[PDB]
Design an enzyme around this catalytic site. Sequence first.
Site, short mmCIF file in Angstrom:
data_model
loop_
_atom_site.label_atom_id
_atom_site.label_comp_id
_atom_site.label_asym_id
_atom_site.label_seq_id
_atom_site.Cartn_x
_atom_site.Cartn_y
_atom_site.Cartn_z
N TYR A 116 -13.38 29.43 19.56
CA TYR A 116 -13.36 30.90 19.34
C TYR A 116 -11.94 31.45 19.24
O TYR A 116 -11.72 32.38 18.46
CB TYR A 116 -14.13 31.57 20.48
CG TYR A 116 -15.61 31.35 20.46
CD1 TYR A 116 -16.40 31.98 19.51
CD2 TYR A 116 -16.22 30.55 21.42
CE1 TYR A 116 -17.75 31.73 19.43
CE2 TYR A 116 -17.58 30.32 21.37
CZ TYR A 116 -18.35 30.92 20.38
OH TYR A 116 -19.70 30.74 20.33
N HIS B 96 -16.78 33.29 26.15
CA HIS B 96 -17.85 32.68 26.99
C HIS B 96 -17.25 32.28 28.34
O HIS B 96 -17.62 31.24 28.88
CB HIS B 96 -18.53 31.48 26.30
CG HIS B 96 -19.15 31.79 24.98
ND1 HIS B 96 -19.83 30.82 24.26
CD2 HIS B 96 -19.21 32.92 24.26
CE1 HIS B 96 -20.31 31.36 23.17
NE2 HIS B 96 -19.96 32.67 23.15
C1 LIG Z 1 -17.30 27.87 19.12
C2 LIG Z 1 -18.04 28.30 17.89
O1 LIG Z 1 -19.21 28.02 17.69
N1 LIG Z 1 -17.30 29.01 17.05
C3 LIG Z 1 -17.86 29.57 15.84
C4 LIG Z 1 -17.59 28.69 14.53
O2 LIG Z 1 -18.15 27.37 14.52
C5 LIG Z 1 -17.17 26.34 14.76
O3 LIG Z 1 -16.55 26.36 13.47
C6 LIG Z 1 -17.41 25.92 12.38
C7 LIG Z 1 -17.07 26.32 11.07
O4 LIG Z 1 -17.23 27.55 10.90
O5 LIG Z 1 -16.72 25.42 10.26
C8 LIG Z 1 -18.52 25.25 12.47
C9 LIG Z 1 -19.13 24.92 13.81
O6 LIG Z 1 -20.31 25.77 13.95
C10 LIG Z 1 -18.13 25.14 14.93
O7 LIG Z 1 -17.35 23.98 15.08
C11 LIG Z 1 -18.14 29.48 13.32
O8 LIG Z 1 -19.58 29.63 13.47
S1 LIG Z 1 -20.44 29.17 12.24
O9 LIG Z 1 -21.85 29.04 12.79
O10 LIG Z 1 -19.81 27.85 11.75
O11 LIG Z 1 -20.36 30.11 11.04
C12 LIG Z 1 -17.52 30.89 13.32
C13 LIG Z 1 -18.11 31.77 12.26
O12 LIG Z 1 -16.96 32.57 12.01
S2 LIG Z 1 -17.01 33.54 10.88
O13 LIG Z 1 -17.95 34.63 11.51
O14 LIG Z 1 -15.49 33.68 10.54
O15 LIG Z 1 -17.68 32.95 9.65
O16 LIG Z 1 -17.80 31.67 14.63
C14 LIG Z 1 -17.02 30.77 15.38
O17 LIG Z 1 -15.82 31.10 16.01
C1 LIG Z 2 -27.32 33.51 22.95
C2 LIG Z 2 -26.60 32.41 23.63
O1 LIG Z 2 -27.11 31.27 23.65
N1 LIG Z 2 -25.37 32.63 24.11
C3 LIG Z 2 -24.64 33.91 24.15
C4 LIG Z 2 -23.56 33.98 23.16
O2 LIG Z 2 -24.01 33.71 21.90
C5 LIG Z 2 -23.61 32.59 21.13
O3 LIG Z 2 -22.21 32.88 20.96
C6 LIG Z 2 -21.84 33.73 19.85
C7 LIG Z 2 -20.49 34.31 19.94
O4 LIG Z 2 -19.82 34.26 21.01
O5 LIG Z 2 -20.08 34.89 18.94
C8 LIG Z 2 -22.70 34.02 18.81
C9 LIG Z 2 -24.15 33.50 18.79
O6 LIG Z 2 -25.00 34.56 19.22
C10 LIG Z 2 -24.35 32.35 19.81
O7 LIG Z 2 -23.78 31.14 19.36
C11 LIG Z 2 -22.83 35.32 23.33
O8 LIG Z 2 -23.66 36.46 22.93
S1 LIG Z 2 -23.21 37.24 21.66
O9 LIG Z 2 -23.34 38.71 21.98
O10 LIG Z 2 -24.10 36.78 20.45
O11 LIG Z 2 -21.81 36.92 21.20
C12 LIG Z 2 -22.35 35.48 24.80
C13 LIG Z 2 -21.85 36.91 25.08
O12 LIG Z 2 -20.43 36.97 25.01
S2 LIG Z 2 -19.50 36.26 26.08
O13 LIG Z 2 -19.99 35.86 27.52
O14 LIG Z 2 -17.98 35.99 25.58
O15 LIG Z 2 -19.40 37.74 26.71
O16 LIG Z 2 -23.41 35.16 25.70
C14 LIG Z 2 -23.74 33.87 25.42
O17 LIG Z 2 -24.48 33.46 26.36
#
Ligand SMILES: CC(=O)N[C@@H]1[C@@H](O[C@@H]2OC(C(=O)O)=C[C@H](O)[C@H]2O)[C@@H](OS(=O)(=O)O)[C@@H](COS(=O)(=O)O)O[C@H]1O
Ligand SMILES: CC(=O)N[C@@H]1[C@@H](O[C@@H]2OC(C(=O)O)=C[C@H](O)[C@H]2O)[C@@H](OS(=O)(=O)O)[C@@H](COS(=O)(=O)O)O[C@H]1O
Length: 966
Positions: free
Chosen positions: A457, A450
Amino acid sequence: ATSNPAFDPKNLMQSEIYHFAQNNPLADFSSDKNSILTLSDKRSIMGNQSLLWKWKGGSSFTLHKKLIVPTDKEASKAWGRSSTPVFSFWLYNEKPIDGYLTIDFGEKLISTSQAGFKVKLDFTGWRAVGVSLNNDLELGAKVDSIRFKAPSNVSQGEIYIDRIMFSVDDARYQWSDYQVKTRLSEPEIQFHNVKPQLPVTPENLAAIDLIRQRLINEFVGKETNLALEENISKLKSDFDALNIHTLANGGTQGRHLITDKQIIIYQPENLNSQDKQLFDNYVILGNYTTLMFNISRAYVLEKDPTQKAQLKQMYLLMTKHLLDQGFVKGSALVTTHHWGYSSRWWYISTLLMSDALKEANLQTQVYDSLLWYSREFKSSFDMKVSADSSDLDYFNTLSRQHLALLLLEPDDQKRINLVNTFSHYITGALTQVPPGGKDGLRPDGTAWRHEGNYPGYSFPAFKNASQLIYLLRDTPFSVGESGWNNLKKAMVSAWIYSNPEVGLPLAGRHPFNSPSLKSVAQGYYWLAMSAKSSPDKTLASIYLAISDKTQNESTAIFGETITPASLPQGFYAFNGGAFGIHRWQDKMVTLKAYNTNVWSSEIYNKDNRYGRYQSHGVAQIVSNGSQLSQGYQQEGWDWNRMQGATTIHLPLKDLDSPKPHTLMQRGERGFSGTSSLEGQYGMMAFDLIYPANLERFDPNFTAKKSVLAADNHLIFIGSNINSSDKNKNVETTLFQHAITPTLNTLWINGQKIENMPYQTTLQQGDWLIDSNGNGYLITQAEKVNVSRQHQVSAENKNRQPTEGNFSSAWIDHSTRPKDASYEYMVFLDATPEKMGEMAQKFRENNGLYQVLRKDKDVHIILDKLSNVTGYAFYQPASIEDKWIKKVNKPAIVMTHRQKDTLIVSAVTPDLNMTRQKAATPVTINVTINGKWQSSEVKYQVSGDNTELTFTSYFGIPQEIKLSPLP
Ligand SMILES: CC(=O)N[C@@H]1[C@@H](O[C@@H]2OC(C(=O)O)=C[C@H](O)[C@H]2O)[C@@H](OS(=O)(=O)O)[C@@H](COS(=O)(=O)O)O[C@H]1O
Ligand SMILES: CC(=O)N[C@@H]1[C@@H](O[C@@H]2OC(C(=O)O)=C[C@H](O)[C@H]2O)[C@@H](OS(=O)(=O)O)[C@@H](COS(=O)(=O)O)O[C@H]1O
Ligand SMILES: [Mg+2]
């Protein structure tokens, strides 16, 4: 299905479905003489029966259903996003047909009579067909006829049809495939191949099989978002509930498989109660593939030969049901977007079951299927290094799946070419400096998603990238040392800026839910043990600290005795997030700013709503351990009072982001961040500048805020503080933390304060200690408020009310209507006796420090405890100083005169880039007084003075040790 028309303007979002689980199920259908319609309970998609259509070539049947086909605009208005009316159905061929099924729309049609489309019938198993009625036909409001014509040029034939449906669907997600052409296509993977090729040899084949085994080992002996089930009773019970059975001349019957995203085409919130009940019988693929994986893991570990055989039969049957359900090459299933969430553990299961799939002759079908569905990831899976290749989500959710797909390739030479190419891909992705804000590692050790440094991340990407390098180690496929080195830099950096959670300023959109290095622990072992000279003692020493393992435990883990790393000490600059870390004993202080290249905060629709001040020159102090246990409690937290910040105290309705969805507020100039000297001393320079015209942001709110950090202390100074309203509600927070039985005491001027509530006002020469043992000496301020009080706040996701008891102290700047200022000093090891001593040294003509300049051009702080001087050049200037004479760019300069030497560091925290462009180095000319001789810093004596030439690349400080010329 109802008597109403499809897309009844009355109830547009209600899908009309022909599933035949209702009274008089063929009521709406007619056939010509050369077609026969029966129900069959042999197989079905929705409900327990499907339409058996026996036909001679050219024969038709007709569905009679009035369609009030909406425009894309009307569909979109009804749902709230870009939408199209869709026609969809499922068909099963028991044998392939060489020709096309024709579907025609019109009014009062018969065999012999507007618009339509074709479906190629060369396949077996279930296929789904879905087309936009507005965009995909080769439609006037009076349509009442949907005519299915068998192919002409084919003498006779038979087809099962179920779940003929009229629905409103997402305009992005009717994808072309080998059966239907639509306006939309996800092109197939085209694998890159690196030269030279590695040959098929016993050594290279053995290395491939060891990589597969090492992957198996990681998955059979804890993954996030893998719902692990090890109880075989439970796996058998879940599996039986799928009601799968093999059929006579091929295929299966069992509960219909659908992805979490495929369900959209039904609009399930809007389904009639009858359809909802049938829909609710579907199985979500994510759950199904998780089950396949859990069975594969149980199979691999199973010691009982009878149970072991049972688990294999369960896996292969699930595989056969998955393929017969149309999860096969060339079958779009209308869409499979976000395929990874539904399928990630299917990929991994194939490694564990690779020999079972070989023996069953299923490996080529499963490889072709997974390759086909992976086309959604073509930008990474093609394995051509690009500016987007360093994607941190990829490293987390897809990299091991990518490897597993490649290892599933049936030809040995192609498998070796793919894994060779993958090693090159991963090396480049981990080595390159991506331009601008693109994801990936950076040269200061920050790691971006982002478009900024993002631990939330980067931490899961570090774990899995370390594992990938470890899986490939000591083979012809090993990752290049350049990628190992870069990742080491980022992971040693993460150990420095976490304690063991990253501070509030690094929490991204998840304040009070910081990522923890505990979740990355195994990555330190993996990366240490994958060193060219393994084990890497630094990474091994960190793994032991973070995982709470002793020196006695090291020999078995690493093959030699390693002492668990002690917490890092000193100062580290990370301008990739306009931050710095000061470490002393068990404390970390996160100093954070923002600028044009560093967003202040990530605020989403339901995340971080009150996070405006996350990066406002904060200086959060964290002792090693839980931040919640140190009083960083979200309930009742005053979002105005982030530790070290200068802020406007606002009601939460006004502090809330003015954007209902996303705001990532960037600063008004390139220059703000930190620098370092000798790895021990630090300075922050923060130019607080607000946007000219953003709602709820005071365009005249300003401040210059500097911090010098050395050993057990930090000197905080501020100048040029202003607002639109004479500094009304403008405040600098010394600290805020929750009051608990363990965090119950404040000291003020040697007196213990424990009453709740409590308020007092302090001034210059007063001091406090918070419950975390930080001392604050007020060295310049008219008015410091101290409060122990019940606070009401709101939580950052849904703004719901919270409350808690807090100890806090802040400077009230309203006493200086124009160009307000402050100074104060923090002791990280404060005791009432030491703060009495520091206050006495302050009263002795300030024996602690001296501010040599404090204006809009320069802040200069001489620390008399450390003998270090920090120079924050907010603007280029000539100055009067013992050491520094002139600096030609905004910069941070630092000096330390020791015995026979002067050490000078310089940087600009400006990364000198945009969201699009690569950072380029800034040349900074620092003139110093006197003649000096000696680092990549150049120097030239020039009259009675010395010109130093610094190269500031990505805000990475440089220093030089000088000694006087006679
Ligand atoms: C910055 C962000 O939103 N990262 C995503 C993760 O969420 C952080 O970690 C967790 C957690 O997984 O315990 C919970 C909170 O949402 C955030 O502090 C997590 O997204 S998720 O919605 O929690 O599943 C991971 C999912 O990763 S997975 O695809 O390995 O399951 O995506 C993050 O990096
Ligand atoms: C939809 C939104 O509010 N934000 C877009 C991002 O999505 C979130 O982030 C992620 C993620 O980074 O894995 C997953 C979930 O969709 C949302 O929490 C993300 O879009 S993505 O294609 O879903 O990942 C980014 C695009 O990537 S970035 O700028 O690193 O290029 O755009 C956010 O705005
Ligand atoms: Mg049915």
